[PDB]
Amino acid sequence: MKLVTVIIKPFKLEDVREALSSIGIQGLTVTEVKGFGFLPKVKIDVAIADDQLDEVIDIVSKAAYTGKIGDGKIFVAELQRVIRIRTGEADEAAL
């Protein structure tokens, strides 16, 4: 499992959110944040199966790209476990 974090300009929220839906990813979390690189930013977190990693950074990158400074960055970390409180399903079954 992986946790993929995208931090971008608040205006590209729509573009990345729709890109995500393309490959069947609707579950996600968005935090209003400030990035010093201080300006308003949108942080988007998404837990996925290992098999989807390259598929996700690909679609996100293209969705955010403009070629101009400030397109954003992608951060990847390992997720030891995910649990759906309602069912108790874990990992891939919890998504």
Ligand X SMILES: Nc1ncnc2c1ncn2[C@@H]1O[C@H](COP(=O)(O)OP(=O)(O)OP(=O)(O)O)[C@@H](O)[C@H]1O
Q: Is 67 annotated as a binding residue?
A: no
Among 41, 42, 59, 63, binds ligand X (CB under 6 A): 41
Residue 73 is assigned to a ligand binding site:
yes
SS3 9: coil
Out of 15, 35, 49, 55, point to the residue binding a copy of itself (CB under 8 A): 35
- Asked whether 8 and 42 are in contact (CB, 8 A), the reply is yes
In 10 A of CB 72, how many CB atoms?
Answer: 21
* 49 in contact with a copy of itself (CB under 8 A): no
| Amino acid at position 46, single letter | V
- The least CB distance from residue 35 to a copy of itself, in Å, is 5
How many angstroms separate the CA atoms of 42 and 38, rounded?
Answer: 13
Binding site for ligand X (CB under 6 A): 7, 27-29, 35, 37, 41, 45-47, 69-73, 84, 86, 95
